[PDB]
Amino acid sequence: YFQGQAPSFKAEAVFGDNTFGEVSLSDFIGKKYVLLYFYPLDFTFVCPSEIIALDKALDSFKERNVELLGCSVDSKFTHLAWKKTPLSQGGIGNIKHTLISDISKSIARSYDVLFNESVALRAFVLIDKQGVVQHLLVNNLALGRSVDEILRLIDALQHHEKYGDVCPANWQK
Amino acid sequence: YFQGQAPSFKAEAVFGDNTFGEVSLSDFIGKKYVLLYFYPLDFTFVCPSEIIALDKALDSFKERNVELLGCSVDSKFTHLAWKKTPLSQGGIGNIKHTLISDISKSIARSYDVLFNESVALRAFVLIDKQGVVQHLLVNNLALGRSVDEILRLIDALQHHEKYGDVCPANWQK
Amino acid sequence: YFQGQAPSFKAEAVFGDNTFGEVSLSDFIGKKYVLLYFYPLDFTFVCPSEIIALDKALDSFKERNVELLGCSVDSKFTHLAWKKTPLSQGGIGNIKHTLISDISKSIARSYDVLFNESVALRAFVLIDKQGVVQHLLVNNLALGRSVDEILRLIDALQHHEKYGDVCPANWQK
Amino acid sequence: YFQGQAPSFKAEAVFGDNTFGEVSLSDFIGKKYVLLYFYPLDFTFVCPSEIIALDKALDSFKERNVELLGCSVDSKFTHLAWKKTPLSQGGIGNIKHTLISDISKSIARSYDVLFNESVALRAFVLIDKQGVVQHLLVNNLALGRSVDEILRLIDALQHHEKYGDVCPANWQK
Amino acid sequence: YFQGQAPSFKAEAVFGDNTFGEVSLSDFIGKKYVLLYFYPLDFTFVCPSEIIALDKALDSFKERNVELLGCSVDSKFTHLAWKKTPLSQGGIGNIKHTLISDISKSIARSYDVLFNESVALRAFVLIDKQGVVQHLLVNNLALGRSVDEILRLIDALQHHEKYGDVCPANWQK
Amino acid sequence: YFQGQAPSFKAEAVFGDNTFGEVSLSDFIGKKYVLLYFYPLDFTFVCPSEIIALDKALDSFKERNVELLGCSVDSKFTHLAWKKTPLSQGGIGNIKHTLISDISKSIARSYDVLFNESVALRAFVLIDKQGVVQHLLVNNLALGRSVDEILRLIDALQHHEKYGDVCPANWQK
Amino acid sequence: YFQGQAPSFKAEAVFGDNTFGEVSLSDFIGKKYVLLYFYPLDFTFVCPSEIIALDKALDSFKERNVELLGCSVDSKFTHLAWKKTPLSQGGIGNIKHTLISDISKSIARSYDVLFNESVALRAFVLIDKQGVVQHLLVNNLALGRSVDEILRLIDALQHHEKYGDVCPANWQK
Amino acid sequence: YFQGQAPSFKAEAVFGDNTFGEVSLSDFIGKKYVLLYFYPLDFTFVCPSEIIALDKALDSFKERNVELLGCSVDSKFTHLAWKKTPLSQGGIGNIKHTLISDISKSIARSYDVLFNESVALRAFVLIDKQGVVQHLLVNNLALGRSVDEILRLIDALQHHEKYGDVCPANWQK
């Protein structure tokens, strides 16, 4: 879970292109950091503040070599229809980051974010280039407003990998 | 785990006073936010960068109404002896925040941070005034260097509770 | 399963009105016969020949006191968006019979029609006014083309309840 | 069950000849469609309306390349004695289709038609040339009167295999 | 099993009268000794040497206050048809002792005489007026020829209950 | 149990010689019939009527090619001491048939004659030259007085193996 | 096991009197210390060095208020016969301390001294007046020669209860 | 447990040198006898009467070829800090025998001395050169005062291995 590799997955996905494909978490090993996020459902009457805020800050994730992956229990076909629905009609519009489909609910379950065997709870999961979990943000920290905070944690992660931790001055073995 | 209450505990503890007592996570409900952190062991030759950095920033946690709780699998007696050992001799000195004792390893286990049924992995767990988990920081984000980041997440949490999430401008039900 | 009551359910639903509600199979006891049907997913590129054929023959089901219930693993929100998508754009249009939502997949599972813990297989289940299964049609009999056959089975069911079975002429106890 | 092959069996049987043999459901693969039917017991005082009606329509099943298989928990020896009992004395007479014997009750159990670990419930199971279930008719649809309906479903099955389903006119991907 | 009461049962039965009823092993407590016997099947081509030999010696069992109970996995309806079939046509004729029906196979199973979850093995079980097993005869001792031996064991049982065991002359505590 | 081979055993034993050895039930296959008998304990104040009666009739068992095996949960050492105790002092004297020792209670358990995980119940088990159980005599038929009856069953067994069962005169397939 | 009460038992026993009775370990609570010892079997050809050495030192146990209890898997009847066998004939003679009988092997099992579900291993178990285990002596310390050592441990136990442990001179909290 | 080898272990350890290493119980096979002892915790306010008494008698164990091993659930790092704390400040000082670390609590558990999945109970375990348990001393016999008694048991063990047990004079097979 937090000891070694993040739970692996092989899922169906709608790319920025609106073309379908398969995405495995291992595809990003030694290539990109992954910001995997969960949301409950497509097409609801609760505004999709996290998908939109994250997509609005897509270039900030790309500059930091981070692959954004949005995940819900909906099918890839539902994801595509929600992208073909404009924001003015309750849709997400043509977002440019990938939406993965957790139709069997196994992904949500492996990340311990599945609510009453039905929908995923809101969660932000940062995974490093080796496939190791660095953070899990939930509840009042898993909001669209949290984008600025996620990017600061990515900068801290990237800074920590480069320089390591610091020792208290007066401490000695 | 991330759905409702954080795993409950009733543990032995060494207070800032160097006096012993009992601490329950529920003692802080409707009183304080809790920053529960784990570290593997007392008395090792790896500098205690997280205990010291957090204690150096104690006043920043108090101003934000956050109770700092340090936890390892060591006994309260070992915690006390490590506080009575100065930094120059490999100790932590008289830190002013509480060190809880997870002698049965049940706390570490309930937070899924127990490594090979022996020691806890490094972790920072932020819990709100209702006893609900807001974040879990691990691996390269569970360093002493992370203090600035923890406080920014507390400020975001506190800001999010006050104002809620924001909706994309052009989105409509 | 086929001995007494059909598996019970309490599900979310999109009515003919495009209004949301809850539907329990027991709501129809002593009121209506139920033709519960399953299909895999909303929004796919396989034409929805069964939803459309059944809705086109809705008045034939109403005259025979049969409540049509369509079911897939999609949410009620997805069902509503697929109804708000016209046939020319790959939608189902404003169908006048109820679409129930099996978001937890428990309904499909109870009827033994859940394929690889993901989607429901095509199935037509006829249930009497006492809540007892009369038929299960699957595979090459669970097609849109089958509507004429379903109605003939309803007429046979209704005729059998009224008159009972017939005995061979020359047979004697 | 309804996903791939119908439950397989290897049973003792009384043929039209009144000779004994073994019948496996797989014997009919790529040869015949199978109409497997269950009834509770031989020699009862309830007239055998389903065995007799089906045998009276045997030529209609043969013209449609359908093998009729009657099944109860009785032995092949009991089946033979019931065939050697004329209709006027409470028997079935010399029927020309096969009666299989489910002495261990394993067949009934695999088709989920075993009542209180004793006798099979009335059921009509249509199986295609590949050994896949197409329908299950039970309760008020598992009557002798249902013969006309079974044959119409066979005609629909055979028609559906030849031509496939039909798409709604105005629907487009 | 052999410690206290013989396995209890409540079964369907064909009496000497050819009338149907229910028989419980407990009906005979404080009334009769019971000679419960098992055989595999009715209507086979193996002569029913045990049913016939026992019925031919019925008066010898009645004089010794023994109730004869024949048991197989066949239904009461099959038992009745086999009694209505004369010996010359492979039947048992109008036997005057009761044939019980073990349709669920639970009786055979409780006496550990059920062969491959299908038919009962040949067995002679003598039960006393308190419902306690006195003997089990099987294999080459469970033959029709064994009648003379069964009656000698009943005489020994009845003699042993009246007088108890005998002590060796020269033995002393 | 009664289907094929009697439960196998390899036990410690006191022979007629008062010498110790090992006895396996399989040693007698194709050589002797075995009359295995159980009794609760050595050295009690209940006279050993079955050991003594059987030993007094030893020559009758030898003439019929039957190996007598007495069994209790006592050790071979206890068996030997009870044989070295004369009948006048509560012993069995120098009996000439084998006493096997069921120190682990596994033999009694395999024959379903173990009472409250402590001692064996009285039982007479006749086993043929192929190692198959022919009878089990218990309770009021497992007395010392039963010797005459055991020998009559051996004569019937031996007669049945030679000539088989007899068919009723007027019966025909 | 070693935390609170020693495993409880209610066993059959042969007293010094050669009279039979029942012994419960709880009978000695607040009355006597108990030296419970195990040995494999009565009547063997291995001299009973532990029973004899302990009985020869009986008065040393009585002066120290210790109840000696000898235990093996043999019956009380075997124990009595071994006491009625003199030492010159391989017996134990009239020992004056109690021999308990572990016929079900449950006592040996509860003390973890049961060897291959057959006999108890040699063991000396000292139990205090509150029913708490103070020592377990096994293998090369569970010999008849060990009597002097057992009594020294009883003297140490009794001395430790009276005066408690001693603290190192220069040690301070 | 007491049948063959004492539970094996591979543990971290602080040697007399104050250097760290690994200790396996098997390292001492065919070399030394082992006196493995357990105590609950380092750094408590209960004086360490057993560690100190045993270390004060170290030369008596060395002369008898006995390796002293002290064990608690504390880490090797805590053990080292307690040795670097003088007796006057509540420490153990520079003891010259090994302290093993049972950080996972698996050793305590294998010896059945783990109290409430937290700390080990006081116990003295003597193990021979073949790795076989000879004694377990607990409760009021597991005190610092017990050193004189432990050494007398070692002398008895060593004497018993050399000369074996003694037979009662008048006893004969």
PDB file of N, CA and C in Angstrom, chain C residues 139, chain D residues 1-9 25-26 29 111 127-128 130-133:
ATOM      1  N   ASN C 139     -28.883 -14.920 -24.291  1.00  0.00           N
ATOM      2  CA  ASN C 139     -28.084 -15.101 -25.508  1.00  0.00           C
ATOM      3  C   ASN C 139     -28.900 -14.749 -26.790  1.00  0.00           C
TER       4      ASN C 139
ATOM      5  N   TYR D   1     -23.294 -20.817 -16.128  1.00  0.00           N
ATOM      6  CA  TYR D   1     -24.744 -21.040 -16.067  1.00  0.00           C
ATOM      7  C   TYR D   1     -25.425 -20.535 -17.369  1.00  0.00           C
ATOM      8  N   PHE D   2     -25.463 -19.196 -17.580  1.00  0.00           N
ATOM      9  CA  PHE D   2     -25.964 -18.536 -18.805  1.00  0.00           C
ATOM     10  C   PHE D   2     -24.781 -17.886 -19.544  1.00  0.00           C
ATOM     11  N   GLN D   3     -23.553 -18.106 -19.056  1.00  0.00           N
ATOM     12  CA  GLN D   3     -22.340 -17.548 -19.628  1.00  0.00           C
ATOM     13  C   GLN D   3     -21.547 -18.763 -20.106  1.00  0.00           C
ATOM     14  N   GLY D   4     -21.584 -19.000 -21.409  1.00  0.00           N
ATOM     15  CA  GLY D   4     -20.943 -20.164 -21.995  1.00  0.00           C
ATOM     16  C   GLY D   4     -21.770 -21.430 -21.819  1.00  0.00           C
ATOM     17  N   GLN D   5     -21.086 -22.575 -21.720  1.00  0.00           N
ATOM     18  CA  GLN D   5     -21.716 -23.890 -21.689  1.00  0.00           C
ATOM     19  C   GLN D   5     -22.694 -24.179 -20.564  1.00  0.00           C
ATOM     20  N   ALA D   6     -23.829 -24.799 -20.935  1.00  0.00           N
ATOM     21  CA  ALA D   6     -24.815 -25.283 -19.972  1.00  0.00           C
ATOM     22  C   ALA D   6     -24.142 -26.365 -19.107  1.00  0.00           C
ATOM     23  N   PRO D   7     -24.527 -26.510 -17.824  1.00  0.00           N
ATOM     24  CA  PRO D   7     -23.899 -27.557 -16.992  1.00  0.00           C
ATOM     25  C   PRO D   7     -23.865 -28.920 -17.682  1.00  0.00           C
ATOM     26  N   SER D   8     -22.688 -29.518 -17.736  1.00  0.00           N
ATOM     27  CA  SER D   8     -22.494 -30.788 -18.419  1.00  0.00           C
ATOM     28  C   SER D   8     -23.030 -31.956 -17.554  1.00  0.00           C
ATOM     29  N   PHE D   9     -23.363 -33.073 -18.190  1.00  0.00           N
ATOM     30  CA  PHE D   9     -23.812 -34.277 -17.491  1.00  0.00           C
ATOM     31  C   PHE D   9     -23.549 -35.515 -18.326  1.00  0.00           C
ATOM     32  N   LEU D  25     -24.608 -34.537 -22.453  1.00  0.00           N
ATOM     33  CA  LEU D  25     -25.121 -33.349 -23.122  1.00  0.00           C
ATOM     34  C   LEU D  25     -24.245 -32.924 -24.331  1.00  0.00           C
ATOM     35  N   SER D  26     -22.926 -33.144 -24.208  1.00  0.00           N
ATOM     36  CA  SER D  26     -21.891 -32.919 -25.216  1.00  0.00           C
ATOM     37  C   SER D  26     -22.033 -33.821 -26.460  1.00  0.00           C
ATOM     38  N   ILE D  29     -23.446 -31.713 -29.266  1.00  0.00           N
ATOM     39  CA  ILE D  29     -22.740 -30.544 -29.784  1.00  0.00           C
ATOM     40  C   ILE D  29     -22.454 -30.690 -31.299  1.00  0.00           C
ATOM     41  N   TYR D 111     -28.667 -27.316 -12.621  1.00  0.00           N
ATOM     42  CA  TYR D 111     -29.602 -26.452 -13.313  1.00  0.00           C
ATOM     43  C   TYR D 111     -30.426 -25.609 -12.320  1.00  0.00           C
ATOM     44  N   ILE D 127     -31.228 -25.494 -25.280  1.00  0.00           N
ATOM     45  CA  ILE D 127     -29.771 -25.437 -25.442  1.00  0.00           C
ATOM     46  C   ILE D 127     -29.464 -25.508 -26.943  1.00  0.00           C
ATOM     47  N   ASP D 128     -28.565 -24.637 -27.420  1.00  0.00           N
ATOM     48  CA  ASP D 128     -28.209 -24.553 -28.837  1.00  0.00           C
ATOM     49  C   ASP D 128     -27.180 -25.606 -29.247  1.00  0.00           C
ATOM     50  N   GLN D 130     -24.098 -25.375 -29.886  1.00  0.00           N
ATOM     51  CA  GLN D 130     -22.828 -25.134 -29.229  1.00  0.00           C
ATOM     52  C   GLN D 130     -22.891 -25.448 -27.729  1.00  0.00           C
ATOM     53  N   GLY D 131     -24.055 -25.886 -27.216  1.00  0.00           N
ATOM     54  CA  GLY D 131     -24.221 -26.222 -25.802  1.00  0.00           C
ATOM     55  C   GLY D 131     -24.481 -25.018 -24.891  1.00  0.00           C
ATOM     56  N   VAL D 132     -25.024 -23.921 -25.438  1.00  0.00           N
ATOM     57  CA  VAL D 132     -25.292 -22.676 -24.711  1.00  0.00           C
ATOM     58  C   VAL D 132     -26.809 -22.542 -24.428  1.00  0.00           C
ATOM     59  N   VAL D 133     -27.171 -22.174 -23.186  1.00  0.00           N
ATOM     60  CA  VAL D 133     -28.557 -21.996 -22.774  1.00  0.00           C
ATOM     61  C   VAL D 133     -29.147 -20.800 -23.488  1.00  0.00           C
TER      62      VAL D 133
END
